[PDB]
Design a protein around this motif. Structure first.
Motif, PDB file in Angstrom:
ATOM      1  N   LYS A 249       3.358   4.329  -1.544  1.00 39.74           N
ATOM      2  CA  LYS A 249       3.465   5.078  -2.787  1.00 39.74           C
ATOM      3  C   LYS A 249       4.654   4.581  -3.617  1.00 39.74           C
TER       4      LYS A 249
ATOM      5  N   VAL B 117      -3.796  -0.091 -11.243  1.00 35.31           N
ATOM      6  CA  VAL B 117      -2.755   0.265 -10.272  1.00 35.31           C
ATOM      7  C   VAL B 117      -2.838   1.741  -9.827  1.00 35.31           C
TER       8      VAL B 117
ATOM      9  N   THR C  45       4.089   0.556 -11.460  1.00 35.47           N
ATOM     10  CA  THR C  45       3.718   1.434 -12.563  1.00 35.47           C
ATOM     11  C   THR C  45       4.862   1.500 -13.574  1.00 35.47           C
TER      12      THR C  45
ATOM     13  N   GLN D 294       3.790   1.292  -5.518  1.00 32.02           N
ATOM     14  CA  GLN D 294       2.904   1.611  -6.630  1.00 32.02           C
ATOM     15  C   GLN D 294       3.730   2.190  -7.776  1.00 32.02           C
TER      16      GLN D 294
ATOM     17  N   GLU E 267       0.781  -1.230   0.000  1.00 28.93           N
ATOM     18  CA  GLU E 267       0.000   0.000   0.000  1.00 28.93           C
ATOM     19  C   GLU E 267       0.820   1.290   0.000  1.00 28.93           C
TER      20      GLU E 267
END
Ligand SMILES: CCCCCCCCCC(=O)N(CCO)C[C@@H](O)[C@@H](O)[C@@H](O)[C@@H](O)CO
Ligand SMILES: CCCCCCCCCC(=O)N(CCO)C[C@@H](O)[C@@H](O)[C@@H](O)[C@@H](O)CO
Ligand SMILES: CCCCCCCCCC(=O)N(CCO)C[C@@H](O)[C@@H](O)[C@@H](O)[C@@H](O)CO
Ligand SMILES: CCCCCCCCCC(=O)N(CCO)C[C@@H](O)[C@@H](O)[C@@H](O)[C@@H](O)CO
Ligand code: NA
Ligand code: NA
Ligand code: NA
Lengths: 256, 256, 256, 256
Positions: D14, D107, D21, D17, D12
């Motif tokens: 940043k 995502v 990405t 992610q 979870e």
């Protein structure tokens, strides 16, 4: 005077409007029949006399109005001035006589209100329209300099470029007809045309939506005023008056 | 009577609607299969019997409704009259039998409500639609007189001009197909066609947006009424009732 | 100082804006005349001197502003930085001199506010724009692999595919020009192109409507602030303050 | 357990992610490079290994999530199920590997919210979409029967008719390409095609506007909830609670 007052009541009646509307429709029908190039000489002569009769009825109608309202009182309205010009230009010799069918708008109050809403919404979109004009002028100068020597039918001069950029903004054959043939000679021309399309379609849709949203709100207010005498107050004014009533009762409760 | 009441409850049930919907779909499928020109004589005969069976089921359905509601009570609804006409015209010999698939709209209440919202929004855009009609008629007369002798396939007569101006308003080949060929003979024809496009696209978008915005609001009210029995009161009525409660308490505080 | 203050008042006057606007228009007109390839050597020389004169007037204007506001105070505004760059790039040798007609936007406050509303609405549609970009990239890779060997002019490589999918999204000859010829070789190609059109037209209209709705609201607030010093508070804040006044009087009545 | 909790916090974050990405973007770039048919065998082999590496990173990511949330807890989300299917189908041999670039939507939370708003707006336009489907089916059956024998490439069968009516609804060459050639054989064909265009363009714009207006409102609520935990209450609920406060103080003043 009593006579001018009886004439005003005749003019403002529903039956007089219905007769004038029927004469506009009849005049429009005879001008439409006159487009038929196969008509006999006698048929054309007959239709021209019906057109002449329609025009005389409008002269009587306009004179009746100028007498019942006064010269300055009649010309105080833009619709009356339009009705006057439209009829007066036919007397004294444009070939576009069919433009007097626009009197259906000036004579019918609900149609008049639609046009009024559209005209009144124009100042509010003036800056969006000027922005589109600036983009078109800049693009036309660039397109003329970039493609005018290699594609002179489409971009040979400023006027030609403005015309083909208007076609490009409407998306009409923009690629198969214009940009793919241009890219065969100038491979990076998509760098000019694709941003031009994105900017102008966004801006013209902003211009159209701004006109429509405002024209609809103005026309709706005008319909309300024509039926009841007043329009619905904006929600902001209702909430302002609600807050005023709360201040009056708060000053009370506190010490009363 | 008890019998007519038991029949009404059968008609108004979800299962009866589902059966009638399935027969409309089946009838639509057999009419779609009948378009296939390669079918054998036996296959065509079979499909025509399935179509005949579907039509008989609709006759029983309609008769069941007329008995349970009464002749005047059944014909009181526009949807029932539509269902009656659609089925009755098939008996007694149009070739467009596929139009009875429109019964999916009349039978399904949520689809019926979408169409109702669109029909009820039509009076409110009548003046915008009349303005577009006036512009089209004037433009068709002008185009016929201006270009009919030099471009008779597109503008040779009023009917041809109305058709090509409708194509021009939809922006379909307006320039590469129509206006550039016209300008080769009449260089200033862009003075006619570009304002025509600007006016009609703005007016038709006003017409479409006016229909959509109003149809959506009417259908949403009709969905609310069909589920709860009532619709959400407009914000103006809520603010009016809020102001009424403030007047009742202000008259109080002042001297109470 | 008093001098810098007298210069600021000259710069911020309506007459100074009108003179600078007239010089931008004059410079735009001479750059438009310079597109005419039939001009004599003397006419071209004259127009180049008028362009040089316009550019010198903008230098005086910019220097006047930098002195009256300070180096850091002038460059604090994005519009001043734009005006500075536009004029400074002309000194020291792009061929696109016509881009200084964009100064009509930066100099006229109502036009500046339209552009500001559009720029400020961009972050809010960033995710809709990224979604359209993802769909375009995926579709371009698929189209290249599916149709690149059989239709190399339209889909031979990623760049070609992106270009023809942009044409397809604008609906320009999408069927008669692209998909019917593709389907002659790949009969199920409609399974790719019809969902591509449905998705991209919905997404691009969402992107455009989102920009327009937000730009119109931002520009309207900016017009209000430029005239009165403040903007209309949102209805939510009005209802919040109305509820606060009710809590103040309820605490009262209860025990007062 | 503490370990599963430390893994959930990693997932979870940043930074996690941003890494996932970046791997989706890298995988999309190598699949885009693989479209280039001029690549050497070694370059293709290298890109296939980068694709294999990207797919392994997604396997580790998915396994990490299934362990930290539980089998039923992971599959409780539609986005997690989508991420699982997208990665799992690559293992065990579709040719459309580029579809895993859709993971940018799943995502990135702001992109996920745009798609969620669009999916959630679909039930609300189901009846408008069904109405368009009914009109298309009826029109395709009629067009096949009317024009199939004389224009078999466009209307020879139901499938061909649906395709050319979809082209006609998009206004693409509808007149110069389809209806003028049809009218040369069937002079009144405009009676079919012009009402078809008016109905479908109005209905498809109603469908698109309904999707957009609702998707924008749902996404805006979801953005508010993701940042503050709650969304703005509708104006109706604010006015309902305002009326409740007035009833509480009115019962007071009356006798208190
Ligand atoms: C903002 C929208 C502005 C659109 C209108 C701009 C063009 C107006 C001027 C114009 O069209 N012409 C100048 C008058 O002669 C004629 C031609 O220069 C041009 O139309 C070419 O297409 C020719 O090749 C036609 O045969
Ligand atoms: C408001 C929108 C109105 C659009 C419809 C207006 C035209 C209706 C009349 C009509 O189309 N015709 C008259 C019946 O014969 C046929 C032709 O005059 C015309 O369509 C030409 O294009 C021909 O050349 C076709 O072959
Ligand atoms: C999101 C919208 C993106 C639209 C723009 C994408 C294409 C940009 C790249 C490009 O267009 N080219 C690469 C530079 O060479 C040129 C050609 O590959 C292509 O345009 C073909 O159509 C050629 O055949 C033209 O002659
Ligand atoms: C609601 C929108 C629905 C649009 C899609 C409807 C058509 C789908 C079926 C279909 O397109 N074909 C059937 C599969 O074979 C192929 C052809 O029948 C047809 O596309 C013709 O145009 C051919 O001539 C192409 O070469
Ligand atoms: Na076209
Ligand atoms: Na179009
Ligand atoms: Na075309």
């Amino acid at each position: 005077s009593h006579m001018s007052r009886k004439i005003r009541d005749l003019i403002e009646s529903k039956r007089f409007q219905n007769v004038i509307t029927a004469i506009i429709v009849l005049n429009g029908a005879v001008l439409g029949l006159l487009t038929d190039t196969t008509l006999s000489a006698s048929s054309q002569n007959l239709l021209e006399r019906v057109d002449q009769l329609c025009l005389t009825i409008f002269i009587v109608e306009i004179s009746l109005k100028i007498y019942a309202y006064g010269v300055r009182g009649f010309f105080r309205s833009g619709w009356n001035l339009f009705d006057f010009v439209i009829v007066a230009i036919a007397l004294m010799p444009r070939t576009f006589r069919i433009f007097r069918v626009m009197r259906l708008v000036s004579v019918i109050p609900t149609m008049r209100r639609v046009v009024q809403g559209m005209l009144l919404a124009l100042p509010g979109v003036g800056s969006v329209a000027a922005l589109l004009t600036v983009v078109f002028y800049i693009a036309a100068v660039m397109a003329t300099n970039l493609y005018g020597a290699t594609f002179p039918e489409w971009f040979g001069d400023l006027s030609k470029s403005l015309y083909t950029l208007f076609q490009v903004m409407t998306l009409e054959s923009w690629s198969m007809g214009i940009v793919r043939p241009v890219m065969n000679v100038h491979p990076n021309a998509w760098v000019f045309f694709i941003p031009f399309i994105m900017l102008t379609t966004l801006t013209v849709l902003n211009l159209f939506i701004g006109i429509i949203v405002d024209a609809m709100a103005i026309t709706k207010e005008q319909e309300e005023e024509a039926k009841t005498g007043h329009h619905q107050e904006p929600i902001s004014q209702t909430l302002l008056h609600l807050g005023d009533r709360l201040d009056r009762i708060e000053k009370q409760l506190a010490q009363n």
